[PDB]
């Protein structure tokens, strides 16, 4: 009924990824700048920086029996695809 405790702690990780990485993803291209000062997208860093989104998306997909769990897993998974399509 209620969401699994793993998903609840993933929301803490979802906040961690969103506040750090996914909030910097370019809406148009899916790329990720290195920082504020460095506004370009390095191929290596973008691939590496998207792993947390990839791992979290896999973790969310692992227990995606509910619409929001499907949707946040889908968003994370296709945020990785956006990045790699952009790259």
């Amino acid at each position: 009924r209620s969401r699994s405790n793993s998903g609840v702690r993933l929301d803490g990780y979802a906040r961690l990824v969103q506040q750090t990485i996914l909030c910097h993803q370019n809406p148009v291209t899916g790329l990720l700048p290195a920082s504020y000062d460095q506004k370009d997208a390095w191929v290596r860093d973008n691939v590496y920086s998207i792993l947390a989104v990839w791992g979290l998306g896999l973790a969310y997909r692992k227990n995606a029996d509910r619409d929001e769990d499907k949707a946040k897993a889908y968003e994370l998974e296709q945020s990785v695809v956006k990045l790699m399509r952009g790259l």
Binding site: R1, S4, N5, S6, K62, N63, D65, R66
Partner: protein, 1033 residues
Amino acid sequence: DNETLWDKLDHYYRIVKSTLLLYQSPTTGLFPTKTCGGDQKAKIQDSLYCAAGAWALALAYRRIDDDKGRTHELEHSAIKCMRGILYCYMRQADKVQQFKQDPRPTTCLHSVFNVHTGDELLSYEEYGHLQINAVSLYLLYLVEMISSGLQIIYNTDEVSFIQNLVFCVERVYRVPDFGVWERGSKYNNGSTELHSSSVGLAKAALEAINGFNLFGNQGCSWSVIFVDLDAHNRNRQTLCSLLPRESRSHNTDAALLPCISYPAFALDDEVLFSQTLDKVVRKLKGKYGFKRFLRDGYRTSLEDPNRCYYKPAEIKLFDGIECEFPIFFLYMMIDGVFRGNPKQVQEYQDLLTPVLHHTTEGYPVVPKYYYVPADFVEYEKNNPGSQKRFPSNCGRDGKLFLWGQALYIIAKLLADELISPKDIDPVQRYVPLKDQRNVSMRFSNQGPLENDLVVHVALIAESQRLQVFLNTYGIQTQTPQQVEPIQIWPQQELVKAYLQLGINEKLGLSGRPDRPIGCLGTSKIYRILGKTVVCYPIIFDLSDFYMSQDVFLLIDDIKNALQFIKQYWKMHGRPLFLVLIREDNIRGSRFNPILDMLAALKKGIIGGVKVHVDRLQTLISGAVVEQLDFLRISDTEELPEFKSFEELEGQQPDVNISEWKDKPTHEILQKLNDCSCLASQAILLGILLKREGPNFITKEGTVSDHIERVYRRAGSQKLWLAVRYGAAFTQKFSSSIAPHITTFLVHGKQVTLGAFGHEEEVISNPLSPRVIQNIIYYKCNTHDEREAVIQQELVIHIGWIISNNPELFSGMLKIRIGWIIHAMEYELQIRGGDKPALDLYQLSPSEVKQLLLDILQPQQNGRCWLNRRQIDGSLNRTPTGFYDRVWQILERTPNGIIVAGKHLPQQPTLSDMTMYEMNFSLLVEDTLGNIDQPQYRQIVVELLMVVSIVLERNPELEFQDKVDLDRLVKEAFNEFQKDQSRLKEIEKQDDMTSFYNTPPLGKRGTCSYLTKAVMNLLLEGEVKPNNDDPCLI
């Protein structure tokens, strides 16, 4: 027609409110069967259709915005009835639990309830409550109304009960029931019998309810109903096998329209649909209605009302005077609207109008049945359909047929296009010829005619030593550890996981019964407890039986499983077929057959089934995952991790059976140490469990497990004697034998389980694994325990053939196991020459299948004709349509047929049954059963064929006296002697050999003398001048 749609709907509102809704029970919501009389009876089948009628008018009133509260009244009149059935059903939850574990007529849900209280009204003795049509229709309509927006299920506790109702419906393929007509058959013996309508309704109920959220739009993952595909598949295999016949007794039934048309639409093949529709239209349509079935005596003038059961001879008097039910004009009317044929709608509307009656207010009354009066029965029989029939229900009497009245509303609303066909069919039970992409309903992505299904085949090796060593031969495989986060399970672990589905400690429901998951179920990808689990097919389990250890059968089991998935997988995703290879399969000469199959899978095709060999991670990425959420909603997140598959890190018997069994001394225990053979051990341990108790201690340990160790160890060597004794003396019984038998008799084939010349038990009706286990070991075989193991060997083997090569057993109406094992054992004598022949218990189960296949062939090539008549005779194989020709024979022999002291008279044989009927086909073999020589059987079966040839092409001749075929066989016999004595003067006297070896067709063949024998006695009779070809002279 300027009438407003309010006035059109108000017209039906009055009928609905005054004819069926007026009688809805305020307490239970059920609709009484008898409106006048004070009877408390409320039938689920009738009440369900009454709910649909109010629901149908609610759907019509959904098009009126100013409904004046009539949509709510009619929507919630259906909900009140639907919940009342649930209230009655849940009050019988102890029966639902029992019917899940052991489906039986005495453990089933009641189909008749008190309309005012919901209590149990009639016991199993008074009433036949086993009516799967009721439970299936409840599940079907429950999906229909919930999909339309009616909120019937209120909490997960009810969801658990509906899941248990689904479990009761899964097993129905093997459960004979009394059917919709609460009668079973024409004979009224109170005998349950498998009905196409009941099994088809179960198929319709399972398709609509699979993955269905009982909460509607206000629903989450914990209200979806899970359906076992394979029990649904075996329900459909039963439906396709039984059809176009309703059952064994009924070639057709009016109940087929509720099954193959509204509300079920259970047939997905348009050829069969047509075939099955015509037999209803031809043999049951009438002016006043449809006859429920041929020779139906329900409420007929020739029926004794006091007696609840019909005499075996009473069904004869019921021909031509069967009650005609107007309700099936409506069913055809609903069929016409659904199928887009307006001529059908108008034609059956023009037939209802004469049979419709009206109340004092002009409201239509649909009579239950139209019966010929007692004064007009005999005129009706001579010329059917020419005499007036009186209505059962006329209106203005107080007696109303609520099922007919409700179904009138549905058909008329459809006919006047006030409700769309899709409105009463929100979950689409009727699908047009655009038959693609419906789960569980035969409409895959490819559609209705193309079936080039690609099965995802994952190659799994049990150990790395096998993994790398197979890799050295060009085959890529992955050990379970290589596929790590994924879990490869035995199908049992899936059953153990499924044990928690549908449990209600409040209702005392125990969950899904412990039944093996078959190929289609294991073809799905499951996610349990956050772990993605793929179960390999049961065919790879080394516990159920020992033919999985035979590499050739495993290769054929792998092939036929893929063909089984290619034929019966109809879900959105691609099925996953995990292939498990054990070291036993590679060791020895078994590599060469296993490698070619694996190479074929790598090549992409095997058995004509397209397969895709790839890593398990590849074949799992985008497939639909069955979420076993019930294992987490109960907060059982700490449930024990189900045991996934764990990677692993020569002479003939010198001891004869009679040599030491006769030996009275107990020194045989020392002889056990003296001898060195495994079979000698496998016999010595067996007597020790009988002579010295069940769990005596031996050198290795207890007797019970020491024989189990030997059985496990003997199979490793492939010493088949010891593995056959090992499985026989432990009373081993795989889960497949019982369903295999059920597959046999739904094809029209009786099964006998016993050795030749000993007690044989005929399996007329489907039986549970428990009784068949008692059948196959305790009563049937006691001369030799290995008889049962060999008996179970063929049953799976015939189960293998009956599906791949169904034509192979055509004519063989009775699959008699021991009679078949004679055919192989006698064939070994034939092939053995003047040498000690092979033993059927020495042959590997592959050679058992091949020799069985050899001795079954349509025509053995070039063999001794004597021997052919032996192979065909032992199998009791008959020509196609042979049983039909016996009618044409019996139709034209007034005094019948006498053979081997068994007489088949013209009467009451012709009067009692029909000449497509299955019962007559059983009657001939009972008459034919006294012939001991299988070769002598064929020459008689040959003779009955030729006399049928004489009778058909020569209708002028007719027999006077009893046709004693032994004399005709004997008469044609001596003519062969005197002819051959003239040739070479063979000195053998009363020897069939020369007569048997000659081919029928030839210069002087058997059927030539058989033809002469018939004509000599056929010309001994008066010739009848025939008007078909008036004799020119």
